[PDB]
Design an enzyme around this catalytic site. Structure first.
Site, mmCIF file in Angstrom:
data_model
loop_
_atom_site.group_PDB
_atom_site.id
_atom_site.type_symbol
_atom_site.label_atom_id
_atom_site.label_comp_id
_atom_site.label_asym_id
_atom_site.label_seq_id
_atom_site.Cartn_x
_atom_site.Cartn_y
_atom_site.Cartn_z
ATOM 1 N N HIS A 85 65.094 48.429 67.425
ATOM 2 C CA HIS A 85 65.613 49.538 68.223
ATOM 3 C C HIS A 85 65.254 50.831 67.492
ATOM 4 C CE1 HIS A 85 69.390 48.782 65.869
ATOM 5 N NE2 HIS A 85 69.660 50.061 66.070
ATOM 6 N N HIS A 87 66.982 53.309 65.943
ATOM 7 C CA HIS A 87 67.728 53.941 64.858
ATOM 8 C C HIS A 87 66.977 53.864 63.521
ATOM 9 C CE1 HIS A 87 71.777 53.398 67.165
ATOM 10 N NE2 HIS A 87 71.136 54.490 67.540
ATOM 11 N N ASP A 89 67.721 52.693 60.623
ATOM 12 C CA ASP A 89 67.720 51.413 59.908
ATOM 13 C C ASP A 89 66.687 50.429 60.446
ATOM 14 O OD1 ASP A 89 69.640 51.368 62.103
ATOM 15 O OD2 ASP A 89 70.486 49.473 61.281
ATOM 16 N N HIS A 150 74.234 47.013 71.334
ATOM 17 C CA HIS A 150 74.346 48.052 70.321
ATOM 18 C C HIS A 150 73.597 49.306 70.728
ATOM 19 C CE1 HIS A 150 74.082 50.008 66.422
ATOM 20 N NE2 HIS A 150 72.786 50.083 66.659
ATOM 21 N N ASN A 181 78.481 50.766 64.204
ATOM 22 C CA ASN A 181 78.220 52.109 64.698
ATOM 23 C C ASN A 181 77.878 52.049 66.180
ATOM 24 O OD1 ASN A 181 77.471 54.760 65.115
ATOM 25 N ND2 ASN A 181 76.769 54.940 62.989
#
Ligand SMILES: C[C@@H](c1cccc2c(-c3ccc(CS(C)(=O)=O)c(F)c3)c(C(=O)O)[nH]c12)N1CC2(CN(C(=N)N)C2)OC1=O
Ligand SMILES: [Zn+2]
Ligand SMILES: [Zn+2]
Length: 232
Positions: A85, A87, A89, A150, A181
């Protein structure tokens, strides 16, 4: 010394690998965000005499350290990477990978979201994943889009040779107490997306979350449970 690594056991600025199955490792690194320290996982899958990387190590320097750790522990070249995805990280470190000769991939949705929000942008688009339940092959793995969870773009990865399910950040570890998150999450759709994963990969033997300890299939039901309670 053999246990799944945590923030307490990874030296500052370093990465550790963990053998999951023959030709399958996770990678573990730690990063600070908004004044707290978190671990995060990725995956490495042997692809003949090359390696496929799933997700960065959350940051440029962590990702350079990841490449060094792979060379030390495995010694085969990383030729392709998929980010699951948009993000940091998952994509933070894509610029390092690209300068090290790694071809970087993500869905068009992930690429758009990364670009719009100022995160690093994988080079190549992965078509065939835009509808929930879609699956495509990519080297030694299958990529699966379960639906929004998420994030709206999250992908999961299955290693059929080893029955390893890498859930990414759509899947939480058993000790989790909330849904992590949730800034970009769809808490109402997430249980349906997890159900799709459960239905599609009923023979998974190891389930790896985006953050924290791997386990068995119970991580999927636990994730649905913590997300429903979070939303509530
Ligand atoms: C880098 C990543 C992130 C940064 C910092 C922390 C996290 C976590 C996380 C937090 C707690 C736990 C323990 S737990 C399950 O017991 O809660 C956990 F397992 C994972 C996760 C995840 O959940 O994947 N991602 C994190 N970003 C930042 C961002 C995007 N954004 C905007 N405002 N735009 C916030 O959104 C998100 O995800
Ligand atoms: Zn995320
Ligand atoms: Zn995450």
């Amino acid at each position: 010394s053999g246990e799944y690594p945590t923030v307490n056991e990874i030296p500052v600025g370093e990465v550790r690998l963990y053998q999951i199955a023959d030709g399958v490792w996770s990678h573990i690194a730690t990063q600070s965000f908004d004044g707290a320290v978190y671990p995060s996982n990725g995956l490495i899958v042997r692809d003949g005499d090359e390696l496929l990387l799933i997700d960065t190590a959350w940051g440029a320097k962590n990702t350079a350290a990841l490449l060094a750790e792979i060379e030390k522990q495995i010694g085969l070249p990383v030729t392709r990477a998929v980010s699951t995805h948009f993000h940091d990280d998952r994509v933070g470190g894509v610029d390092v990978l690209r300068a090290a000769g790694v071809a970087t991939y993500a869905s068009p949705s992930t690429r758009r979201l990364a670009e719009a929000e100022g995160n690093e942008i994988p080079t190549h688009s992965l078509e065939g994943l835009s509808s929930s339940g879609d699956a495509v092959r990519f080297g030694p793995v299958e990529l699966f889009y379960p639906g929004a969870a998420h994030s709206t773009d999250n992908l999961v990865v299955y290693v059929p040779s080893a029955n390893v399910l890498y859930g990414g950040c759509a899947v939480h570890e058993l000790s989790s107490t909330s849904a992590g998150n949730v800034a970009d999450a769809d808490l109402a759709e997430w249980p349906t997306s997890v159900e799709r994963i459960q239905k599609h990969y009923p023979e998974a033997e190891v389930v790896i979350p985006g953050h924290g300890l791997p386990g068995g299939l119970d991580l999927l039901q636990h994730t649905a449970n913590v997300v429903k309670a979070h939303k509530n």
